[PDB]
């Protein structure tokens, strides 16, 4: 909520955007981990009755 601080943060260049990129890489990787661990089965098998 400060434009004044958000102007001074432009002087630091691409730090802010590469942090969001790094956290997005982590965040997508959590879904990738979950996909790699659980989605090893290509069909939702269900039990007999």
């Amino acid at each position: 909520d400060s434009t004044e601080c958000s102007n001074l943060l432009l002087q630091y260049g691409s730090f802010c955007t590469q942090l969001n990129r790094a956290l997005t890489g982590i965040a997508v990787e959590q879904d990738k981990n979950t996909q790699e661990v659980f989605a090893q089965v290509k069909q939702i098998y269900k039990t007999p009755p």
Binding site: D1, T17, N20
Partner: protein
């Protein structure tokens, strides 16, 4: 998105861009509405210090 990625082409995906905020709709002021003028003449223009 084009500005966020510094690119005129953008590929199939989901991209963070800006952050949405509801705007400050009015500028509220809440103060102790005491009537007395402060005694600054007796601070600065007093007979002796």
């Amino acid at each position: 998105t084009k500005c966020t990625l510094k690119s005129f082409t953008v590929e199939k995906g989901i991209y963070q861009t800006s952050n949405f905020r509801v705007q400050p709709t009015e500028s509220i002021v809440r103060f102790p509405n005491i009537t007395n003028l402060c005694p600054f003449g007796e601070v600065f223009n007093a007979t002796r210090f």
